[PDB]
Amino acid sequence: GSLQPCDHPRQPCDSSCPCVIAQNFCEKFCQCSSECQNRFPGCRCKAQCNTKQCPCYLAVRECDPDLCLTCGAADVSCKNCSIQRGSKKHLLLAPSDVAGWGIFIKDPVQKNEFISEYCGEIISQDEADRRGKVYDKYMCSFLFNLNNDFVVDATRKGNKIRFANHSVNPNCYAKVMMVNGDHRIGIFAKRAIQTGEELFFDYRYSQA
Ligand SMILES: [Zn+2]
Ligand SMILES: [Zn+2]
Ligand SMILES: [Zn+2]
Ligand SMILES: [Zn+2]
Ligand SMILES: [Zn+2]
Ligand SMILES: [Zn+2]
């Protein structure tokens, strides 16, 4: 059960806690003490927080304003707070070099660098399969597979990066990240990308 808070009033998060059994950190939604030993401790980085040297970056979570007290998360020296702050690289929507409409990056990025949140509704494959066969009011829809269980629907609540085209050889990928207790989708560069290049995702399975 993904994102299930534990709730065992007056009891600690021991080997009887579902979070501990399933081997996941206790999160913001869990009813346990803020001092719970099964919670994520955050980081004490000096800045950046964009390499495996950062505990938060490594655990696929953004830094936490009330836990990451040195890196800049509580203040833009921390580069692991972008989804929270609504920060992103500059992107251009333009006619694709391939065909139709495309997204072109306007800032250079390095391999594994954050580009933008991919906004939308995270839904199950079941809910996606429904929307797919059922009569819909929206004409032009935007959806891709995160993995084999979940899809992002960017039709109603998407942002500009939803216009990025499909490729089985993509230059970008998606991370499902823990962001202040919620799962949010980050788009990262799969390789170094120069300014003016078109961005591509693998729609089959974007979570690389
Ligand atoms: Zn617990
Ligand atoms: Zn818990
Ligand atoms: Zn706990
Ligand atoms: Zn850090
Ligand atoms: Zn941190
Ligand atoms: Zn940080």
Numbering used by the authors: 523 to 597, 604 to 736
The authors write:
The final model consisted of one EZH2-SET domain (chain A) containing a total of 209 residues, 6 zinc atoms, 159 water molecules, and 1 sulfate ion. The core of the SET domain is formed by a three-stranded (β-3, β-7, β-8) anti-parallel β-sheet pressed diagonally across a second smaller three-stranded (β-4, β-5, β-6) anti-parallel β-sheet. Unlike many of its homologs, the C-terminal Post-SET domain of EZH2 does not encode a zinc-binding motif and is largely disordered in the crystal structure. Rather than looping outward and downward after the conserved tyrosine at position 731 to form the lower lobe of the SAM cofactor binding site, the C-terminus turns upwards and packs against the loop between β-strands 5 and 6 and the outer edge of β-7 with the backbone oxygen of the C-terminal Y731 forming a hydrogen bond with the backbone nitrogen of β-5 N673. When compared with structurally homologous SET domains, it appears that the conformation of the C-terminus in this position would impair both cofactor and substrate binding. In those structures, the C-terminal post-SET domain forms part of the cofactor binding site without a zinc stabilized motif.
Methylation of histone (H3K27) by PRC complexes is believed to be catalyzed by its conserved SET-domain containing member, Enhancer of zeste [E(z)]. Unlike other SET domains, i.e., SET7, SET8, and SUV39H1, EZH2 is inactive on its own and requires binding partners (SUZ12 and EED) for activity. EZH2 sequence mutations, expression levels, and copy number aberrations are correlated with the incidence and aggressiveness of various cancers and other diseases.
